[PDB]
């Protein structure tokens, strides 16, 4: 490993462990904080608790 | 019951719909919802 600071994807700021935040599994592999991409707090809390569910960032979708 | 997947992908916007529509009581899971559509 290597010492990394993990950007946001919409705002390009650190997105650190007290972050509450997403990742894109879709193909740009960012992580995102939750606030910046408009997820509510109980889609959030829904996406994580689900096992089977992912999330996927707008530009990823197309 | 059988699932047509393991992976069930949402976008910001579809989570967002998928949670209120829980919160609703219409669906159980977000799951649930993205199944219908
Ligand atoms: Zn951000
Ligand atoms: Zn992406």
């Given at each position: 490993?290597?010492?990394?600071?993990?950007?946001?994807?919409?705002?390009?700021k650190?997105?650190?462990?007290?972050?509450?935040?997403?990742?894109?599994?879709?193909?740009?592999?960012?992580?995102?904080?939750?606030?910046?991409?408009?997820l509510?707090?109980?889609?959030?809390?829904?996406?994580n608790?689900?096992?089977?569910?992912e999330?996927?960032?707008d530009?990823?979708?197309? | 019951?059988?699932?047509?997947n393991?992976?069930?992908?949402?976008?910001?916007?579809l989570?967002?719909?998928?949670?209120?529509?829980?919160?609703?009581?219409?669906?159980?899971?977000?799951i649930?919802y993205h199944c219908?559509?």
């Amino acid at each position: 490993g290597a010492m990394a600071i993990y950007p946001c994807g919409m705002c390009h700021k650190e997105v650190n462990d007290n972050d509450e935040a997403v990742f894109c599994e879709s193909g740009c592999n960012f992580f995102f904080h939750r606030t910046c991409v408009g997820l509510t707090e109980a889609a959030f809390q829904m996406l994580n608790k689900e096992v089977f569910a992912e999330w996927c960032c707008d530009k990823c979708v197309s | 019951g059988a699932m047509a997947n393991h992976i069930f992908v949402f976008s910001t916007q579809l989570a967002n719909k998928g949670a209120e529509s829980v919160l609703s009581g219409q669906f159980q899971t977000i799951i649930a919802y993205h199944c219908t559509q």
